[PDB]
Amino acid sequence: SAVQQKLAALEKSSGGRLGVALIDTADNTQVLYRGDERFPMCSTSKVMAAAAVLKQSETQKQLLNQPVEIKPADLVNYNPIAEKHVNGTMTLAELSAAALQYSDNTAMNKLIAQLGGPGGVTAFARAIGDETFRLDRTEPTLNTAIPGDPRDTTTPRAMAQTLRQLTLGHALGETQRAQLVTWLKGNTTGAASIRAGLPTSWTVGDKTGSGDYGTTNDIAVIWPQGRAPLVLVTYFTQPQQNAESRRDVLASAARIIAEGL
């Protein structure tokens, strides 16, 4: 299709490897580019950790209000929110919001610990029917994004389907689902990524990710005004370990997708 030729051309112009999955919930149609190739998730994995804690809260009704101590030893490489609460506490709700909306890496590690390790995050994926997602490491080493390394990867197709289920479907309870949506819509790190390729009138909830090998990711739910929502996953990685981020590639991929709907 025209869209796949334009995505291929975008990829060729960028020098990297681009993965795209769009789900149009209007007719359940899918648009895939390298849809079944593995990409390093980097921080887009934080959505699965937050959703796993949300699932726990369906039975532990007060779980999200549970305070968790932030100790200096907990701090890793990027902790914009956790830094503000060292030697104090944050609730699991606050850590989930921090992980999602500011991509706080300490917050993510606390969520992983709450789930009993990376295997507990992966287990949630399996429980909701995602057999592709795998979380193997904690922050910050899960971002190494080494070519060919299957650790901490998923595919665009798998992530799109799972993000659809978590936000638009009923993998989570009603209150949990709405909270996840509210968190994604309040993301602060996404202005230059998918959002930048879309009409300003459209509502977007997204989670970015970045890592080594110039890995630059964004996963999004999109609510166009007067139109069924879309799920869009854009993964991008590059052959040089020290390559710079290319959020413009994600904006451009989203623009090409928007041309046609």
mmCIF file of C-alpha atoms in Angstrom:
data_model
loop_
_atom_site.group_PDB
_atom_site.id
_atom_site.type_symbol
_atom_site.label_atom_id
_atom_site.label_comp_id
_atom_site.label_asym_id
_atom_site.label_seq_id
_atom_site.Cartn_x
_atom_site.Cartn_y
_atom_site.Cartn_z
ATOM 1 C CA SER A 1 0.000 0.000 0.000
ATOM 2 C CA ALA A 2 0.930 3.656 -0.307
ATOM 3 C CA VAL A 3 1.467 3.836 3.441
ATOM 4 C CA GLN A 4 3.901 0.931 3.518
ATOM 5 C CA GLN A 5 5.901 2.401 0.632
ATOM 6 C CA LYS A 6 6.097 5.729 2.461
ATOM 7 C CA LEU A 7 7.107 4.057 5.737
ATOM 8 C CA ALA A 8 9.770 2.076 3.865
ATOM 9 C CA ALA A 9 11.043 5.297 2.293
ATOM 10 C CA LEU A 10 11.071 7.019 5.684
ATOM 11 C CA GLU A 11 13.048 4.098 7.078
ATOM 12 C CA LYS A 12 15.523 4.243 4.201
ATOM 13 C CA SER A 13 16.020 7.976 4.703
ATOM 14 C CA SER A 14 16.639 7.510 8.434
ATOM 15 C CA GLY A 15 19.386 4.878 8.278
ATOM 16 C CA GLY A 16 17.771 2.854 11.042
ATOM 17 C CA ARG A 17 15.183 0.123 11.541
ATOM 18 C CA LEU A 18 11.551 1.183 11.932
ATOM 19 C CA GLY A 19 8.684 -0.861 13.350
ATOM 20 C CA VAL A 20 5.086 0.341 13.175
ATOM 21 C CA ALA A 21 1.774 -1.174 14.171
ATOM 22 C CA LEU A 22 -1.493 0.708 13.798
ATOM 23 C CA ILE A 23 -4.804 -0.741 14.927
ATOM 24 C CA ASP A 24 -7.896 1.090 13.713
ATOM 25 C CA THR A 25 -10.592 0.142 16.218
ATOM 26 C CA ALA A 26 -13.284 1.307 13.792
ATOM 27 C CA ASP A 27 -12.939 -1.819 11.621
ATOM 28 C CA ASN A 28 -10.159 -3.623 13.540
ATOM 29 C CA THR A 29 -7.893 -3.150 10.527
ATOM 30 C CA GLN A 30 -4.140 -3.237 11.123
ATOM 31 C CA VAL A 31 -1.229 -1.556 9.371
ATOM 32 C CA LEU A 32 2.093 -3.228 10.066
ATOM 33 C CA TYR A 33 5.669 -2.387 9.158
ATOM 34 C CA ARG A 34 8.214 -4.878 10.498
ATOM 35 C CA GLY A 35 5.271 -5.791 12.689
ATOM 36 C CA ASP A 36 6.702 -9.133 13.824
ATOM 37 C CA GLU A 37 10.322 -8.051 14.346
ATOM 38 C CA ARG A 38 11.616 -7.632 17.868
ATOM 39 C CA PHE A 39 12.614 -4.185 19.062
ATOM 40 C CA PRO A 40 14.053 -3.078 22.405
ATOM 41 C CA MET A 41 11.161 -1.692 24.400
ATOM 42 C CA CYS A 42 13.151 0.624 26.673
ATOM 43 C CA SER A 43 10.759 2.737 28.703
ATOM 44 C CA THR A 44 7.665 1.671 26.772
ATOM 45 C CA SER A 45 7.872 -1.373 29.064
ATOM 46 C CA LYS A 46 6.794 0.861 31.956
ATOM 47 C CA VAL A 47 3.200 0.625 30.734
ATOM 48 C CA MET A 48 3.183 -3.121 31.394
ATOM 49 C CA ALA A 49 4.590 -2.701 34.911
ATOM 50 C CA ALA A 50 2.037 -0.033 35.777
ATOM 51 C CA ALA A 51 -0.796 -2.095 34.332
ATOM 52 C CA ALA A 52 0.385 -5.125 36.288
ATOM 53 C CA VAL A 53 0.160 -3.161 39.526
ATOM 54 C CA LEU A 54 -3.256 -1.877 38.479
ATOM 55 C CA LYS A 55 -4.393 -5.470 37.990
ATOM 56 C CA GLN A 56 -3.169 -6.300 41.494
ATOM 57 C CA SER A 57 -5.258 -3.426 42.870
ATOM 58 C CA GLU A 58 -8.486 -5.030 41.613
ATOM 59 C CA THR A 59 -8.203 -7.452 44.549
ATOM 60 C CA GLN A 60 -6.025 -5.356 46.890
ATOM 61 C CA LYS A 61 -8.382 -2.394 46.806
ATOM 62 C CA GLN A 62 -6.028 -0.090 48.745
ATOM 63 C CA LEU A 63 -2.800 -1.145 47.033
ATOM 64 C CA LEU A 64 -2.272 2.075 45.111
ATOM 65 C CA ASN A 65 -2.240 4.070 48.354
ATOM 66 C CA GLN A 66 0.468 1.887 49.870
ATOM 67 C CA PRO A 67 3.518 4.027 50.692
ATOM 68 C CA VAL A 68 6.885 2.887 49.400
ATOM 69 C CA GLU A 69 10.124 4.274 50.815
ATOM 70 C CA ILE A 70 12.578 5.925 48.409
ATOM 71 C CA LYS A 71 16.110 5.417 49.671
ATOM 72 C CA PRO A 72 19.281 6.921 48.150
ATOM 73 C CA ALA A 73 20.406 3.438 47.112
ATOM 74 C CA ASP A 74 17.186 3.153 45.080
ATOM 75 C CA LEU A 75 18.130 6.014 42.754
ATOM 76 C CA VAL A 76 19.434 5.043 39.325
ATOM 77 C CA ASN A 77 20.287 7.132 36.275
ATOM 78 C CA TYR A 78 17.067 9.113 35.656
ATOM 79 C CA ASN A 79 14.742 9.827 38.599
ATOM 80 C CA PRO A 80 13.121 13.240 38.103
ATOM 81 C CA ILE A 81 10.279 12.481 40.524
ATOM 82 C CA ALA A 82 11.829 9.921 42.871
ATOM 83 C CA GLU A 83 14.673 12.405 43.441
ATOM 84 C CA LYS A 84 12.092 14.743 44.968
ATOM 85 C CA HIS A 85 11.095 12.139 47.570
ATOM 86 C CA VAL A 86 14.392 10.590 48.654
ATOM 87 C CA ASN A 87 14.239 9.589 52.324
ATOM 88 C CA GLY A 88 10.463 9.869 52.135
ATOM 89 C CA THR A 89 7.699 7.780 50.595
ATOM 90 C CA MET A 90 5.683 7.658 47.409
ATOM 91 C CA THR A 91 2.486 5.701 47.007
ATOM 92 C CA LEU A 92 2.263 3.054 44.329
ATOM 93 C CA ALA A 93 -0.131 5.368 42.494
ATOM 94 C CA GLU A 94 2.482 8.131 42.580
ATOM 95 C CA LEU A 95 5.231 5.756 41.433
ATOM 96 C CA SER A 96 3.034 4.524 38.581
ATOM 97 C CA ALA A 97 2.320 8.097 37.514
ATOM 98 C CA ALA A 98 6.005 8.968 37.782
ATOM 99 C CA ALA A 99 7.072 5.970 35.716
ATOM 100 C CA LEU A 100 4.536 6.719 33.010
ATOM 101 C CA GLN A 101 4.370 10.495 32.828
ATOM 102 C CA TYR A 102 8.003 11.341 33.540
ATOM 103 C CA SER A 103 9.625 8.000 32.640
ATOM 104 C CA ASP A 104 11.156 7.840 36.120
ATOM 105 C CA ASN A 105 13.486 4.841 36.268
ATOM 106 C CA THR A 106 13.520 4.507 40.042
ATOM 107 C CA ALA A 107 9.717 4.391 39.972
ATOM 108 C CA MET A 108 9.837 1.601 37.403
ATOM 109 C CA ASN A 109 12.210 -0.438 39.563
ATOM 110 C CA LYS A 110 9.855 -0.092 42.540
ATOM 111 C CA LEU A 111 6.989 -1.350 40.381
ATOM 112 C CA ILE A 112 9.093 -4.330 39.267
ATOM 113 C CA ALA A 113 9.931 -5.131 42.891
ATOM 114 C CA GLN A 114 6.247 -4.897 43.811
ATOM 115 C CA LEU A 115 5.581 -7.538 41.153
ATOM 116 C CA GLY A 116 8.355 -9.836 42.369
ATOM 117 C CA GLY A 117 10.913 -9.082 39.688
ATOM 118 C CA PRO A 118 10.896 -8.809 35.905
ATOM 119 C CA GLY A 119 9.333 -12.266 35.722
ATOM 120 C CA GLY A 120 6.289 -10.863 37.468
ATOM 121 C CA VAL A 121 5.883 -8.181 34.826
ATOM 122 C CA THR A 122 6.293 -10.755 32.070
ATOM 123 C CA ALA A 123 3.759 -12.992 33.816
ATOM 124 C CA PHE A 124 1.127 -10.268 33.607
ATOM 125 C CA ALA A 125 1.732 -9.963 29.859
ATOM 126 C CA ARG A 126 1.182 -13.711 29.480
ATOM 127 C CA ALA A 127 -1.935 -13.549 31.638
ATOM 128 C CA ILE A 128 -3.536 -11.055 29.234
ATOM 129 C CA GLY A 129 -2.495 -13.039 26.163
ATOM 130 C CA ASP A 130 0.756 -11.339 25.146
ATOM 131 C CA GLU A 131 3.162 -14.206 24.466
ATOM 132 C CA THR A 132 5.746 -11.887 22.904
ATOM 133 C CA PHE A 133 6.550 -9.322 25.586
ATOM 134 C CA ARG A 134 9.544 -10.170 27.718
ATOM 135 C CA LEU A 135 11.038 -8.115 30.517
ATOM 136 C CA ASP A 136 14.341 -9.565 31.658
ATOM 137 C CA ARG A 137 16.178 -6.778 33.445
ATOM 138 C CA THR A 138 15.572 -3.769 35.638
ATOM 139 C CA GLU A 139 16.457 -0.138 35.046
ATOM 140 C CA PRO A 140 18.794 1.023 33.668
ATOM 141 C CA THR A 141 20.260 -2.068 32.023
ATOM 142 C CA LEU A 142 17.036 -2.958 30.198
ATOM 143 C CA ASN A 143 17.826 -0.094 27.766
ATOM 144 C CA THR A 144 21.045 -1.503 26.308
ATOM 145 C CA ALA A 145 19.154 -2.223 23.077
ATOM 146 C CA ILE A 146 21.890 -4.474 21.703
ATOM 147 C CA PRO A 147 21.158 -5.632 18.134
ATOM 148 C CA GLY A 148 19.866 -9.177 18.120
ATOM 149 C CA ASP A 149 19.532 -9.390 21.897
ATOM 150 C CA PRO A 150 16.021 -10.716 22.638
ATOM 151 C CA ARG A 151 16.024 -9.466 26.231
ATOM 152 C CA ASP A 152 13.514 -6.739 27.043
ATOM 153 C CA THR A 153 11.962 -6.775 23.579
ATOM 154 C CA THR A 154 8.560 -7.079 22.028
ATOM 155 C CA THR A 155 7.125 -6.717 18.545
ATOM 156 C CA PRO A 156 5.088 -3.776 17.265
ATOM 157 C CA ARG A 157 2.124 -6.037 16.547
ATOM 158 C CA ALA A 158 2.186 -7.543 20.033
ATOM 159 C CA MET A 159 2.523 -4.205 21.806
ATOM 160 C CA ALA A 160 -0.259 -2.612 19.768
ATOM 161 C CA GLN A 161 -2.630 -5.460 20.583
ATOM 162 C CA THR A 162 -1.714 -5.371 24.254
ATOM 163 C CA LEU A 163 -1.970 -1.598 24.547
ATOM 164 C CA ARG A 164 -5.383 -1.834 22.901
ATOM 165 C CA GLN A 165 -6.498 -4.395 25.476
ATOM 166 C CA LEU A 166 -5.213 -2.391 28.445
ATOM 167 C CA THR A 167 -6.683 0.972 27.419
ATOM 168 C CA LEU A 168 -9.661 0.275 25.149
ATOM 169 C CA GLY A 169 -10.463 -3.318 26.072
ATOM 170 C CA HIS A 170 -11.128 -4.957 29.395
ATOM 171 C CA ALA A 171 -7.843 -6.544 30.405
ATOM 172 C CA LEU A 172 -8.189 -4.257 33.415
ATOM 173 C CA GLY A 173 -11.119 -3.377 35.591
ATOM 174 C CA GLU A 174 -13.091 -0.276 34.735
ATOM 175 C CA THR A 175 -11.528 1.972 37.377
ATOM 176 C CA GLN A 176 -8.029 0.669 36.649
ATOM 177 C CA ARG A 177 -8.478 1.121 32.904
ATOM 178 C CA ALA A 178 -9.640 4.694 33.363
ATOM 179 C CA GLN A 179 -6.686 5.457 35.618
ATOM 180 C CA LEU A 180 -4.240 4.075 33.076
ATOM 181 C CA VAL A 181 -5.829 6.193 30.356
ATOM 182 C CA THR A 182 -5.676 9.280 32.551
ATOM 183 C CA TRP A 183 -1.990 8.613 33.225
ATOM 184 C CA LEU A 184 -1.123 8.124 29.549
ATOM 185 C CA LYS A 185 -3.008 11.271 28.523
ATOM 186 C CA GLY A 186 -0.911 13.238 31.020
ATOM 187 C CA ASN A 187 2.408 12.068 29.649
ATOM 188 C CA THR A 188 4.924 14.923 29.568
ATOM 189 C CA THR A 189 7.680 13.362 27.437
ATOM 190 C CA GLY A 190 5.862 12.806 24.156
ATOM 191 C CA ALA A 191 5.527 16.204 22.513
ATOM 192 C CA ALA A 192 8.202 15.574 19.849
ATOM 193 C CA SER A 193 7.245 11.964 19.043
ATOM 194 C CA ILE A 194 3.903 10.559 17.777
ATOM 195 C CA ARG A 195 2.037 13.651 18.981
ATOM 196 C CA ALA A 196 4.088 15.897 16.687
ATOM 197 C CA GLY A 197 2.908 14.065 13.557
ATOM 198 C CA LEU A 198 -0.802 14.318 14.362
ATOM 199 C CA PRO A 199 -3.507 16.998 14.248
ATOM 200 C CA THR A 200 -3.372 19.154 17.358
ATOM 201 C CA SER A 201 -7.098 18.574 17.938
ATOM 202 C CA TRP A 202 -6.589 14.836 18.494
ATOM 203 C CA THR A 203 -6.220 13.523 22.027
ATOM 204 C CA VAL A 204 -3.210 11.292 22.581
ATOM 205 C CA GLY A 205 -2.031 9.185 25.457
ATOM 206 C CA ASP A 206 1.453 7.839 24.979
ATOM 207 C CA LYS A 207 4.556 6.397 26.556
ATOM 208 C CA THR A 208 7.935 7.140 25.035
ATOM 209 C CA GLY A 209 11.079 5.097 25.295
ATOM 210 C CA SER A 210 14.711 5.682 24.513
ATOM 211 C CA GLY A 211 17.904 3.751 24.919
ATOM 212 C CA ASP A 212 21.240 2.960 23.423
ATOM 213 C CA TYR A 213 21.642 2.370 19.706
ATOM 214 C CA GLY A 214 19.629 5.563 19.249
ATOM 215 C CA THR A 215 16.547 3.600 20.179
ATOM 216 C CA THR A 216 13.554 5.937 20.031
ATOM 217 C CA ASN A 217 10.095 4.558 20.754
ATOM 218 C CA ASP A 218 6.566 5.756 21.374
ATOM 219 C CA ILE A 219 3.358 3.831 21.925
ATOM 220 C CA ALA A 220 0.091 5.668 21.831
ATOM 221 C CA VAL A 221 -3.660 5.513 22.014
ATOM 222 C CA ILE A 222 -5.200 8.204 19.834
ATOM 223 C CA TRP A 223 -8.697 9.662 20.144
ATOM 224 C CA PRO A 224 -9.446 11.621 16.961
ATOM 225 C CA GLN A 225 -12.327 14.087 17.395
ATOM 226 C CA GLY A 226 -15.450 12.367 15.989
ATOM 227 C CA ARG A 227 -13.834 9.059 15.050
ATOM 228 C CA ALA A 228 -12.982 5.681 16.566
ATOM 229 C CA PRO A 229 -9.678 5.625 18.465
ATOM 230 C CA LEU A 230 -6.479 4.207 17.079
ATOM 231 C CA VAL A 231 -3.576 2.392 18.695
ATOM 232 C CA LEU A 232 -0.194 3.280 17.227
ATOM 233 C CA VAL A 233 3.182 1.788 18.137
ATOM 234 C CA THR A 234 6.372 3.169 16.586
ATOM 235 C CA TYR A 235 9.726 1.575 17.390
ATOM 236 C CA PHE A 236 13.014 2.786 15.957
ATOM 237 C CA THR A 237 16.586 1.667 16.510
ATOM 238 C CA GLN A 238 19.864 2.351 14.776
ATOM 239 C CA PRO A 239 23.096 0.514 14.012
ATOM 240 C CA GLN A 240 25.507 2.732 16.020
ATOM 241 C CA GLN A 241 25.650 2.226 19.776
ATOM 242 C CA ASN A 242 26.034 5.982 20.368
ATOM 243 C CA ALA A 243 23.501 7.174 17.784
ATOM 244 C CA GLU A 244 21.329 10.106 18.764
ATOM 245 C CA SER A 245 17.599 9.892 19.359
ATOM 246 C CA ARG A 246 15.382 10.398 16.317
ATOM 247 C CA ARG A 247 11.987 11.414 17.668
ATOM 248 C CA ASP A 248 11.381 13.102 14.304
ATOM 249 C CA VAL A 249 11.179 9.651 12.714
ATOM 250 C CA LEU A 250 8.299 8.762 15.019
ATOM 251 C CA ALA A 251 6.527 12.045 14.272
ATOM 252 C CA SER A 252 7.000 11.384 10.557
ATOM 253 C CA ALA A 253 5.716 7.817 10.796
ATOM 254 C CA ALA A 254 2.623 9.040 12.632
ATOM 255 C CA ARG A 255 2.076 11.739 10.007
ATOM 256 C CA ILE A 256 2.241 9.128 7.246
ATOM 257 C CA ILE A 257 -0.278 6.970 9.110
ATOM 258 C CA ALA A 258 -2.600 9.928 9.688
ATOM 259 C CA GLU A 259 -2.549 10.436 5.901
ATOM 260 C CA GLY A 260 -5.200 7.874 4.981
ATOM 261 C CA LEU A 261 -7.545 7.698 7.951
#
